[PDB]
Amino acid sequence: GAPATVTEQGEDITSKKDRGVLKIVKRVGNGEETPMIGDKVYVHYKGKLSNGKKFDSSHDRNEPFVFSLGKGQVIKAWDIGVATMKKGEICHLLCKPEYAYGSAGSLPKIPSNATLFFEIELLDFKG
């Protein structure tokens, strides 16, 4: 499935090159610009545990997820991953626990030491 395909074929976009955040571009975005640190970014996402269990989607309530890029308002994997995206891009990200919810997890949805999969669409970004 999607998660396994990222495991086998995803690009390692961590600076440490520890396979903590693995990426596949699924739809190419617009031009060359990526968001700046501090930008307001608007995304749609579909989130699963690595075993395929859906835990959330912004589409269920048609409500884009909004955050300030690089501010730690989201899991490290999103600060890293979304910074690499162009407007209109869809990617798949696979996120080791060290770049997500670590040993604590986020119960009830996210167990301790969970690797998470996301399909993310970068809808827009603003200053």
Side-chain angles (χ1 to χ4, degrees), residues 1-60 62-127:
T5 299
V6 182
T7 297
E8 295 294 325
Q9 309 176 349
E11 186 180 29
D12 184 354
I13 59 165
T14 61
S15 57
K16 291 172 169 166
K17 296 288 182 279
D18 56 19
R19 291 179 54 79
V21 186
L22 298 169
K23 180 182 182 193
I24 302 170
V25 169
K26 301 309 280 180
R27 185 177 78 190
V28 181
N30 295 320
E32 296 297 310
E33 306 282 354
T34 57
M36 311 309 296
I37 300 305
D39 282 358
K40 201 72 91 161
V41 300
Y42 290 82
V43 300
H44 264 307
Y45 71 100
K46 306 184 186 191
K48 301 176 192 303
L49 300 187
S50 62
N51 69 7
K53 175 53 162 57
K54 181 187 180 167
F55 65 82
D56 220 86
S57 169
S58 55
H59 304 268
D60 290 334
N62 189 21
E63 186 187 301
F65 193 107
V66 191
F67 65 104
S68 294
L69 182 76
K71 292 295 171 185
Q73 295 180 350
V74 292
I75 55 167
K76 296 182 177 169
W78 276 35
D79 278 331
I80 297 165
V82 175
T84 74
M85 298 180 74
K86 293 154 177 94
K87 185 177 162 174
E89 180 181 317
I90 307 169
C91 78
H92 289 174
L93 281 188
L94 190 72
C95 313
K96 286 180 184 189
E98 292 78 18
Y99 292 87
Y101 298 97
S103 56
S106 192
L107 299 173
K109 295 181 180 305
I110 312 300
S112 179
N113 292 333
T115 299
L116 307 181
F117 169 88
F118 298 89
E119 178 172 275
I120 305 165
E121 181 179 3
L122 178 54
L123 300 169
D124 205 358
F125 59 93
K126 306 285 190 191

